[PDB]
């Protein structure tokens, strides 16, 4: 019965071609609910889920202000990074940040995050205890030292344990019809000859939420991984997800193979076989 | 609810 809220922000410099592009998005579990894009006409936080549309103008104004406050800070952090790494104005650089919180089924705080990457590499991260930092290099060690002295971890823990949880709990209630309701996978198996003597069996899971799912193949009731393929879980575009798993088998031996599906929305795991 | 990040590197 646990839930997460996550914000994902990306700043990409383009010196001389205007201010850096800043994009932020916010998720509750696997559902996107807001975006901000510095290149959009509005220059405002915008809704990306039906249930956030309830929020009044005070919400949109204040969230807009906060996200812009972050974008200004991170533009400056891009400058600082250039100095610490001794990089020119010619390059496009990327500063990414993720923060958010995890709550248990009764709303109790489980975990917080507050972390940064520069050009695709870890820069600095708030540790599990929310009292200390991991720096990835000499540059980030300078940042770590400042933030330790300035007791920045304390302010971030205050946000993570407070506002972050408070917000998440409110969105969960307001969005309960879709946020708190599991969608079980609809399943089926397909069969494709590849020669006179081999076939591909494909086990499908469709229309499920949340994204977490496990598909496994067995042969004669024994786990089978040889000759199997698994695609990455993918968005359908309507709020649900898709995945499949496949195995190449000797034609005539299809019946020995079973696909097993585990998902939160299933009261019991599913076992599938090809049934033409 | 967003975190109004103020802190520089």
């Amino acid at each position: 019965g646990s839930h997460s809220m996550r914000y994902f922000s990306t700043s990409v410099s383009r010196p001389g071609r205007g201010e850096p592009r800043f994009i932020a998005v916010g998720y509750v579990d696997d559902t996107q609910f807001v975006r901000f894009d510095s290149d959009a006409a509005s220059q405002r936080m915008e809704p990306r889920a039906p249930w956030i549309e309830q929020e009044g103008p005070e919400y949109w104004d204040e969230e807009t202000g906060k996200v812009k406050a972050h974008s200004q800070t991170d533009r400056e952090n891009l400058r600082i990074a250039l100095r610490y790494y001794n990089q020119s104005e010619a390059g496009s650089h990327t500063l990414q940040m993720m923060f958010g919180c995890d709550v248990g089924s009764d709303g109790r705080f489980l975990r917080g995050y507050h972390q940064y990457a520069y050009d695709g590499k870890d820069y600095i991260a708030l540790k599990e205890d929310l009292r200390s930092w991991t720096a990835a290099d000499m540059a980030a060690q300078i940042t770590k030292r400042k933030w330790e002295a300035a007791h920045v971890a304390e302010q971030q823990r205050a946000y993570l344990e407070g506002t972050c949880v408070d917000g998440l709990r409110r969105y969960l209630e307001n969005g309960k019809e879709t946020l708190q309701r599991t969608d079980p996978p609809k399943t089926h198996m397909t069969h494709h000859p590849i020669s006179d003597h081999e076939a591909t069996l494909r086990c499908w899971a469709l229309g499920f939420y949340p994204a977490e799912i496990t598909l496994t193949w067995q042969r004669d009731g024994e786990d089978q991984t040889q000759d199997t393929e698994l695609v990455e879980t993918r968005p359908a575009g309507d709020g649900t997800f898709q995945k499949w798993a496949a195995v190449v088998v000797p034609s005539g031996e299809e019946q020995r193979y079973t696909c097993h599906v585990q998902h939160e929305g299933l009261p019991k795991p599913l076992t599938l076989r090809w049934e033409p | 609810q967003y975190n109004p990040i103020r802190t520089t590197f």
Partner: single-chain antibody, 227 residues
Framework: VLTQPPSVSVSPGQTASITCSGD??????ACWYQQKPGQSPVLVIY???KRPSGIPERFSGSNSGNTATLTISGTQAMDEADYYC????????????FGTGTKVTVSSEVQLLESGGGLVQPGGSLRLSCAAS????????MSWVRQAPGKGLEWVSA????????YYADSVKGRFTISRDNSKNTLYLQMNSLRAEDTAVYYC????????????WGQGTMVTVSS
């Protein structure tokens, strides 16, 4: 942290320039607040150069390098007041900072209502309240900002919209506790182990991230630690 000249003297009609310097101004907006004696602070400039509705055009602002400047052109007798710059300390997570203030002498439905102030013995306790009206209370972070007699504004404490996050100045940490009853549209400040240095008018101030300023101020409640 935010340095301002002690005073500026002008004659009616001439331009008055008030400066404020600090590293954070480089990557943060400057606000300016006017305060006439007997009256509470008023926002005159936000986001470096923007005036709130109702503020006269003769007040302007800029913020370049690490300096912010409030200019009053054609300064009038009614402009005699103390002016405070305000930004955020970018070295810190959540720390509002007011400039030292400048005394400018000229010579030839929204509502916050504070209460609870009064005389208290040294090492005593007191609880302050503020009732809010005319805006969606739980949509805004609320602060207490104090002013000792004849001194500047000092931000004391802040609380998030739904109350889960609270923030304190180093000066009051461990001794004061901010909280809110959103159903009562009321903010509180529990003050323990009071000292001489706590003697001040305590203002309730509403912050808006949209403007990045305290746009609404109450009338204050006076706390005197004596005897």
């Amino acid at each position: 942290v935010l340095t301002q000249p002690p005073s500026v003297s002008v004659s009616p009609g001439q331009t008055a320039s008030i400066t404020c310097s600090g590293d954070s101004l480089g990557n943060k907006y400057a606000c300016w607040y006017q305060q006439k004696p007997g009256q509470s602070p008023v926002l005159v400039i936000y986001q470096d150069s923007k005036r709130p509705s109702g503020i006269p055009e003769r007040f302007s602002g800029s913020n370049s390098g690490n300096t912010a400047t409030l200019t009053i052109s054609g300064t009038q007798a009614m402009d005699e007041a103390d002016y405070y710059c305000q930004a955020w300390d970018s070295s810190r997570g959540y720390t509002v900072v007011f400039g030292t203030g400048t005394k400018v002498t000229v010579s030839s439905e929204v509502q916050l209502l504070e209460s609870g102030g009064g005389l208290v013995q040294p090492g005593g306790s007191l609880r302050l309240s503020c009732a809010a009206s005319g805006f969606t209370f739980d949509s805004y972070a609320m602060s207490w900002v104090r002013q000792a007699p004849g001194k500047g504004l000092e931000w004391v404490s802040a609380i998030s919209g739904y109350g889960g996050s609270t923030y304190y100045a180093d000066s009051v940490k461990g001794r004061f506790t901010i909280s809110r009853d959103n159903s009562k549209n009321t903010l509180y400040l529990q003050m323990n182990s009071l000292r001489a240095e706590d003697t001040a008018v305590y203002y309730c101030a509403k912050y808006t991230y949209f403007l990045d300023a305290f746009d609404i101020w109450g009338q204050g409640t006076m706390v005197t630690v004596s005897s």
